[PDB]
Amino acid sequence: IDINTKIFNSVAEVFQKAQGSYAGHRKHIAVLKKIQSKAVEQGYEDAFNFWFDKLVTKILPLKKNEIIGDRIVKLVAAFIASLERELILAKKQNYKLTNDEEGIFSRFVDQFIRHVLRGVESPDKNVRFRVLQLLAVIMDNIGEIDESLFNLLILSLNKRIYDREPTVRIQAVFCLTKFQDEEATRTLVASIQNDPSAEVRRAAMLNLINDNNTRPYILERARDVNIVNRRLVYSRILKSMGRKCFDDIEPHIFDQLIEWGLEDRELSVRNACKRLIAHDWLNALDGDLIELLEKLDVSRSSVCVKAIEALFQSRPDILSKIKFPESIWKDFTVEIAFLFRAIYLYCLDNNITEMLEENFPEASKLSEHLNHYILLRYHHNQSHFDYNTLEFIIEQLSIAAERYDYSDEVGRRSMLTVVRNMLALTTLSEPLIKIGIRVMKSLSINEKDFVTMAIEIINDIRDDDIEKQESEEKEASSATIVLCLTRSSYMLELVNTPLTENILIASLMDTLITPAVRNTAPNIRELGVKNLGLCCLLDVKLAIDNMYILGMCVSKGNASLKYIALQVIVDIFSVHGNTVVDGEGKVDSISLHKIFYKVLKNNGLPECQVIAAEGLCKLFLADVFTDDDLFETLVLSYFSPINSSNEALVQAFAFCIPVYCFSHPAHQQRMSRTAADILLRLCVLWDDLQSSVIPEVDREAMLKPNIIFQQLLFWTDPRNLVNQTGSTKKDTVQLTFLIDVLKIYAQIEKKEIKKMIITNINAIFLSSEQDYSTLKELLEYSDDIAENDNLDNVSKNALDKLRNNLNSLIEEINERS
Amino acid sequence: MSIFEKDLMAYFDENLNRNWRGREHWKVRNKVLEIDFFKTDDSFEDKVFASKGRTKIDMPIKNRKNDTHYLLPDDFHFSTDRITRLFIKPGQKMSLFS
DNA sequence: GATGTGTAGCTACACATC
DNA sequence: GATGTGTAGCTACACATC
């Protein structure tokens, strides 16, 4: 036998048994190094390389997950690493080997890479996949390489990153993730943003360098459209950072991250974020709940309420460890003050009886601690930081005080004095004004009482300024007008009885409300309307006399003013309904509807569209509004391309429209009647959008008429009714709609649009329980177009299918009784 | 009014949780045993290294970039709760579905 | 594009072993 | 305690095939 032939027999023997299982791979590595060592002494070095390569080539055409290929891949990867290991630890302390070991390794790896690369651009997916796969698992162990071979690697990879297959695109990053130390990063930052394969982004996400420069793009995936890709940044990336989040992340992004995960739509992402906070971050800070709160900027963050609760549920044991001795109330900080709020409200909601008895001071005693901070804030002189610190503490304690057990008469009267003297303060910031009224509300146990006290705080603040104006002009300064109304709003937000019961408001109204409505300042005008809207919900006649002025404010008012005005009108209708329109001395509803249109149509102010959108849906749900033309104007604003840019408006309709139809048959019926003309108007819009040639063209800013059609089949489908009386199986709501669509089919011009409809007409639901005459009508219109028009073979088939389903249905009817 | 309004309200939240995006997302949404390393068929080897020819093995430049970055749009959490509450008087709520 | 089927990445519980 | 082990199921997501 020949030396060369003997080598092949030896190496081929290795792969034959290595493909069978992972059993004797340790041996095979030792054998291969032996075969190589035997060949180099006989001079046949290049013979070993040749047969090794040719034997690896046998597995490239194998699919992904083909169990055999993986085995060999792992074997080839182990053999290279094994050859480098011997080289590394040797270079460590052992003097250089006389047997030219590095050279053999350098020459073998270079030669091998160039071989596997010969199929880097093969027409076959599997070939290209397994070429990159081999390079990925062997990339770390290559060591030194020639420059030309280095340039050829980055080149072949930079072109494969944009390969057609995702599978091969993945492996393309792995090979790049190694060239990352700081062009490689540049590419991965581009793939993590623009690659349409979630798994290629994920690969570029987890394996990116995580440098100060690349950290933003990585965290960006927190809102990746893929469920997994979002769960990972919490479970994988933030864990890997441990405590580095609090040091090497800007808090403004930090707060945003925790806000998303907690409020995400997928249960799997919330937990993954919850578990990060409770388990990982608490163990990372040695169980110091305060330090954890020091990180989560408690003063500014709006999620501390969400984060803490998930923790209390994840660790009910630490719950009992809290500490609140009388000795403190000296070092009270935003963290401790907030802790007090977080704990106390949590015990009440979950009803932790043992704690509420002694873990919290009495009402009378809490008032002593609360007031203490009020005097220290307002009565006597990093100053602004201190001022904020006190306000936050005052707020937290106040929130806890709002839900106390006030059976204790001494504590109530004590607290009541603290808030009354606080609310009476002129420089009390709005956050504390709000809760103050909320507290004083919980102390009255009598609506009239709560009002009498509040009104007094207002009129006193009013008269104080007026009486000070007596120098040498019988009205309070502008600033005072703001304070009185700010308090009047929250106080009114809590009253739930007519104005006839409480006369003090009618005075207050003529005192400062209506003079504010007529004021020359925006903010005061906005406030006056808010308070006016709160009073209208109590007395109907007050609303009827104010319908005109309100509608006027909307029409001619600026963005801000028109914003608040339109809301009031919605609520007035919510409670009273149509008792405030269409009648003697009452405004005609037609005028208001025209005012809804102009806002809904208005695109210069998006936020106002949302209210007009949200507000009208609510009114249609309440069955107070019943105007087909208006309801039709709603759905148009959903699909319209002009409103596509208003992200808020789309989600508003996407949730209200489906529920509206499925709620009540009469609601769905209203869709069915006006569901045909809408499709027509939209077809025309898509036709004018696609055909028109303009620089500002976003032809993709609208659903194609085929999708829009399916949508209208969805809502009109009676099977989606929630009541399901059992007598709804015969509901002809969807048929009558399709009939109306067929009657319009003659009015569309483009063939493409016509097909877009016909291909989707069979989504309807047909039943033998439905009305016989209605199916016959639907058959004749389908029969009318089945032949009298020219059809694409696809359109005819679907249409013919429908007809025969009709005919097959009439067969199920008549033959009866 | 809360009794049954509560459940129907709870019905639509859980059912329409993933359709919040609206728009196109309205749709509910939703071998070889062994190799013989001894045989020689090396002309098969030339098959592997074949040039691309008319096979594309690449991604259209249209698909290589996307402006949305495949991110998720801002979420306004339009749930049954946000609908029942009034606008200027969030505490009180109206009893639609009645 | 509509399918059916496979796959990735969990997620949970019962457990041992030290 | 923690650390493994095995087993089970789940769901959004790929690819397969026509």
Numbering used by the authors:
A (entry chain A): 7 to 188, 205 to 403, 410 to 498, 556 to 557, 567 to 911
B (entry chain B): 383 to 412, 457 to 524
Q: Which of the paper's sentences describe this entry?
A:
Condensin protein complexes coordinate the formation of mitotic chromosomes and thereby ensure the successful segregation of replicated genomes. A peptide loop of the kleisin subunit encircles the bound DNA and, like a safety belt, prevents its dissociation.
As a result, the Ycg1–Brn1 groove might allow some degree of flexibility in accommodating the DNA double helix. This notion is further supported by a second crystal structure of Ycg1–Brn1 in complex with the same 18-bp DNA substrate, which crystallized with slightly different unit cell dimensions. Compared to the first DNA co-structure, the C-terminal Ycg1 shoulder is slightly translocated, and as a consequence, the contacts between this part of Ycg1–Brn1 and DNA differ considerably from the other crystal form. The conformational flexibility in the contacts with DNA revealed by two Ycg1–Brn1–DNA crystal forms and the low binding affinity to short linear DNA fragments suggest that the positively charged groove alone can only weakly interact with DNA duplexes. The trajectories of the visible residues that flank the linker, however, indicate that the path of the connecting peptide leads over the bound DNA helix.
